[PDB]
Symmetry: C3
């Protein structure tokens, strides 16, 4: 209703208004980045620092030690920690967990010389930063919030974000404020779903030139994305999880077998060392990476990575918190705070150290002095060469195509559901109306997906997330303030 159409038009105007002119599009998107980034980047860091302090308070202060709800944990502790370990479902992870370290060593932070021994020493470590405990802790607050809104303050938070900012909401969030926030939210949240898409596709697509060599061309990106949505509409068409249940159970079965594979093959001893050293590098540099900013040098690093990644982390905040909340009925506040960081950091670290060491090795020993060169056709390209360069370069590259495919096939569905529930009747779940609704936003996510690929930079996707979280930085501080002042007076049994 008041949240349905607003996105719809805002995207649409942005679309054939982008599709009309990409040479001019790629100059606005380009200037907004170097605006929001250079001018307001510090805000994004301070945000995460504050949310990080959040985690300490949540752990050591008042509402720690206090049963986040009724008695009974719906899942066992280990089932819980694993439920988190396995929750990663995105393929943009395999993208970034592949070239990230390459970009770190080619343009280092800290004025270290490109490709130097030192540059390489900080590579994995900066992954361990960007994807370790810190960012995962910045979820604890909005988690313990959205979980308190659920199991102690039995006020089931209807999907939109507004349905929980009355406790702060001066101008009743059931009105305009709440609505102009929920679509502000939804818009970035779709753009992000569009950014995952417009990364996950080229990986599958390029994987395809390793299957009797079907080409990659935008057209082919364009075909496989719609080939998604159809296979995903005709998946909703009838009711039975005899496929989509076991799908996820494979996507995680395969991913751990594939990373186990890269781990073992890449050399266990090397990684066990490079990890160890990178921890100490991380710990050493942690305060410097947090507040790493427009140096007087003006290199653009943290601006390019930290600030961009953090916007992204901002966008999927509450979202990931509803999830973490919904699987944590019985837990203490402190339990969640620990459990999630342990569980999530474990899955995220293994990923980037494994895939990213393997990349560093390749770049280092002259085995595919390609990334640098291969950027003369495709980033996405290099990333699969990174897979390619491995033992049994067939069974892997297949494992990589399938795991990479049925990963994004599960993404398209779960976040068209999440996207439908946010514009629907309150009462139950996917009842009578939730139909051509889900199947339509599929088309919408996907069409922004190619829109970006048409523009073809990394910027198009970078600015997309940045502009996204910019708003949702506020939306987040709100949901969390809203939570405190409630809980504040509404606890102390």
């Amino acid at each position: 209703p008041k949240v349905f159409f607003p996105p719809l038009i805002i995207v649409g105007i942005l679309c054939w208004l982008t599709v009309r002119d990409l040479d001019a599009a790629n100059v606005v998107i380009n200037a907004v980045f170097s605006y929001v980034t250079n001018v307001w980047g510090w805000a994004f860091e301070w945000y995460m620092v504050v949310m990080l302090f959040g985690w300490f308070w949540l752990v050591f202060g008042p509402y720690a030690k206090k049963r986040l709800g009724n008695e009974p944990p719906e899942f066992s502790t280990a089932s819980w920690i694993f439920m988190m370990f396995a929750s990663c479902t995105s393929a943009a992870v395999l993208f970034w967990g592949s070239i990230e370290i390459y970009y770190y060593i080619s343009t280092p932070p800290f004025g270290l010389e490109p490709n130097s021994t030192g540059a390489k020493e900080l590579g994995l470590a900066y992954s361990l930063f960007h994807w370790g405990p810190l960012p995962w802790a910045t979820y604890s607050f909005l988690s313990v919030a959205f979980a308190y809104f659920f199991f102690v303050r039995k006020m089931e938070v209807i999907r939109p974000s507004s349905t929980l900012v009355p406790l702060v909401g001066e101008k009743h969030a059931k009105g305009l404020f709440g609505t102009i926030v929920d679509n502000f939210y939804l818009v970035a949240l779709i753009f992000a779903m569009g950014t995952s898409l417009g990364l996950a596709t080229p990986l599958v697509t390029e994987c395809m030139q390793w299957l009797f060599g079907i080409p990659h061309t935008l057209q082919l990106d364009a075909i496989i994305i719609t080939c998604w949505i159809i296979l995903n509409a005709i998946c909703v068409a009838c009711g039975l999880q005899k496929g989509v249940r076991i799908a996820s159970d494979v996507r995680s079965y395969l991913s751990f077998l594939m990373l186990g594979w890269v781990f073992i093959v890449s050399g266990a001893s090397f990684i066990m060392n490079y990890f160890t050293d990178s921890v100490g590098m991380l710990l050493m540099y942690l305060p410097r990476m947090l507040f790493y900013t427009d140096p007087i040098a003006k290199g653009g690093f943290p601006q390019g990575w930290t600030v961009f990644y953090w916007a992204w982390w901002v966008i999927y905040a509450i979202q990931m918190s509803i999830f973490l909340a919904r699987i944590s009925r019985g837990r203490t506040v402190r339990e969640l705070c620990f459990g999630m960081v342990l569980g999530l950091t474990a899955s995220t670290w293994i990923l980037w150290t494994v895939l990213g060491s393997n990349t560093l090795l390749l770049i280092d020993k002259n085995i595919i002095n390609i990334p640098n060169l291969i950027e003369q056709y495709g980033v996405a390209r290099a990333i699969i060469e990174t897979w390619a360069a491995l033992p049994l370069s067939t069974a892997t590259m297949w494992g990589f195509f399938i795991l990479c495919f049925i990963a994004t096939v599960t993404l398209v569905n779960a976040c068209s559901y999440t996207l439908a529930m946010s514009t629907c009747r309150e009462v139950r779940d996917g009842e009578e109306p939730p139909l051509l609704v889900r199947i339509g936003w599929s088309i919408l996510v996907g069409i922004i997906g190619i829109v970006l690929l048409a523009l073809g930079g990394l910027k198009p996707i970078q600015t997309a997330i940045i502009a996204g979280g910019c708003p949702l930085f506020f939306v987040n501080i709100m949901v969390t303030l809203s939570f405190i002042k409630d809980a504040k007076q509404n606890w102390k049994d």
Copy 2:
């Protein structure tokens, strides 16, 4: 009496014994510095580390959580935190908060190359060190002390420092020990008041060559200082705070408007970044700056700055603690510990980041490649060029002359009062005797003021503080030991 004359003569002998020979004076003062500094510098650091650990204990151990006195806080919490934010009343702050960063970038710590990109990266950060939480926490102990001596242990501490070392005082501090400590104290405490003076004057004086261009010459320094004391004697002459009450209320009104001005003009976005980066630099380097010493290199930095600043911080210790104590009736021990650091660090940080960024910008973009050159006539000079180089270079430079003037006019009075109470009848306040007493020490502070300017280095003022705190390092450890062993057995309600 036993504290009046001793200072008087010790200063006097030092005076026309300096005034006889400055070319020989500037060789003793020169050798005592490079004595006390190089040989005993570590002591000053360890001191501050210990006092810093102090703050942790004070916060997490026993006397935390325990009402520092009776029930009722004389001021509200916000009035309290602001009372601290606004308490800065010195102009030597505007001196150091101006050239400090210049000196950091021209002679860096850590063997970084002068003027390099890296040197500049550490500039503000080292201000944030020297003037952030750490040094301000090293006050908490002597605060919670002098505040305990007041509101739980109703034993109103008569102005001299001795009147509270019997609880430790083996050879009753009411005797000789106590007395030879109170003038040892008073002597450095005046020398310091003399050092503030002999910095605050040239700022006003040079500001004056921006007022139809009245010269600066020592003579003119000499005239304006006595022009102080007269305007300050004839201020005591009759009783009414229809001027000296509203004076302070202006000096703080103007300073925040002037720093707000420099902030906005200098570029908000730049500063917000340079601050952010400098925090992370500070946090990164904090353990290294604390214990930063005579490297094997023997560069002289920490020796020159850290050790000198810390002596200064040592001197105005108890003094600033009586003050902080006297405004904190109702507070908890932990409250004070937090409140003061927050409140004080807030005011101190804003200052040095604002004024000091503005300086770095100027030095950086070739806009006044002067500091280096302008040192061929005046440091004090450069500092106002730093003001000068700003938009509406008239309204500012006036704002800077006035704020800089009526700042030191309030300094001369408040610390001639503090200087009079320390040599007076116990009973009440400024009763019958406190008259020609206050007006005389005015003359004494001021005359040491020019004495230094006659010698004209930064050393004269540097060694002055160093030699000062050297003693008072002990005097401090005393007042604080004295406090513990009392409180120790004299608490646990």
Copy 3:
């Protein structure tokens, strides 16, 4: 019995199987090092990190605050802290506390250039790491264990390590597992006693070419070691501590007088600074040194030092913990945790800063540009030149020969006792059997001693400890797991 012969043969086969071929011996020992080190080094670091976290839990969690036994502390607090300060009894300490800093500055960590100003800046600091609180805290756990096994869980732990792994021991450690662990233990524990020996001798021996110049030759190493065991057998021969009691009381009297000497002479002011700076360097670099690994550079440092030293620390773990446990009857868990680190770190720091500054000074100011050159005959050599170069180069070098002699004379005995009790009747102490047993292992420790010196590297002794702790890393994790799960359910009064 089941622990007596197994060592005996395992050493013996290793002996004339080494003594047959040193040119081939020095190629296996050489390859096992660069195996265990390069491939499994991280394990040794993680171990110490875990044990370091151990100390936090032991201090802040459950069994803190809880009387480690009955009421009465057998020794006073100060007697206790000193008992720890003085417990150092090894001469390999004077070896490492002598050339360590030289090796740090000649091959630095972190890619700093050999002999550079920066290299020297990190020298002492890396000693403060390797021999400060961290490693000493990694004892707290096995201490609080072995002390709990004693005074709350009155189950006097018969000397072998197995006699306390039933609480974990699945396949009853009274059987084979326990036995094949106790000799696995004993073997490394002797090898280590052999490594102390094969370092302590050349120090005494070279000290001897400063006594009308008796030569040093292996033969002479070989003679003085047996001259040990005889003087040590004929020490057991009859019963009276009219010599061996007052021996220790001298060895510690002399060592503190000798280090007091080097301290004062070397320049108090310099050291007080170099210490101070090195603390801040240590604190700064601490997370980096902990996890310092096979860089991508592959320099071999941490591999060479950290990993080797840590193996050593692993070997003398439980051993040093039985000791620390046995002197801490009345103490709280937290008490021990603090007491030991304070006490032990105090003795260890003073040592390496004093001896190691003195070395740096010598290397620095061109006063004995010898270490580099003198390695063309003896490391052991250089180390005494380091003593030699001092004021009253006779009274010292004598003090160094005697303190260095009667230090190792006490070592040979105390750890042939410890070595005998581990293969003996349970009931009392040195009863009827404990005789030709102690005197025999003397011969065994000593013969491995020269075996190493015959091979003559630092590697022979380095790999000896490495291979040692490799096993005992496990043996340690065991004794400590075993302890938790007992205490776990067997506490909570």
